[PDB]
Amino acid sequence: RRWCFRVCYRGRFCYRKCR
């Protein structure tokens, strides 16, 4: 869905799910 958004797991775990 374009507009990536590195989601963070509250603490540091931040993953990018671009599209």
DSSP 1-19: --S---EE-SSS-EE----
Residue appearing with tokens 């540091």? 12
Task: Please give the distance of CA 10 from its chain centroid, rounded to a whole number.
Answer: 11
Solving technique for this entry?
Answer: NMR
Pairwise CA distance, residues 3 & 5, whole Å: 7
Pair of tokens at residue 1:
């869905």
Do 6 and 16 contact (CB within 8 A), yes or no? yes
Sign, CA dihedral 14-5-16-7, equals positive
Pairwise CA distance, residues 15 & 19, whole Å: 12
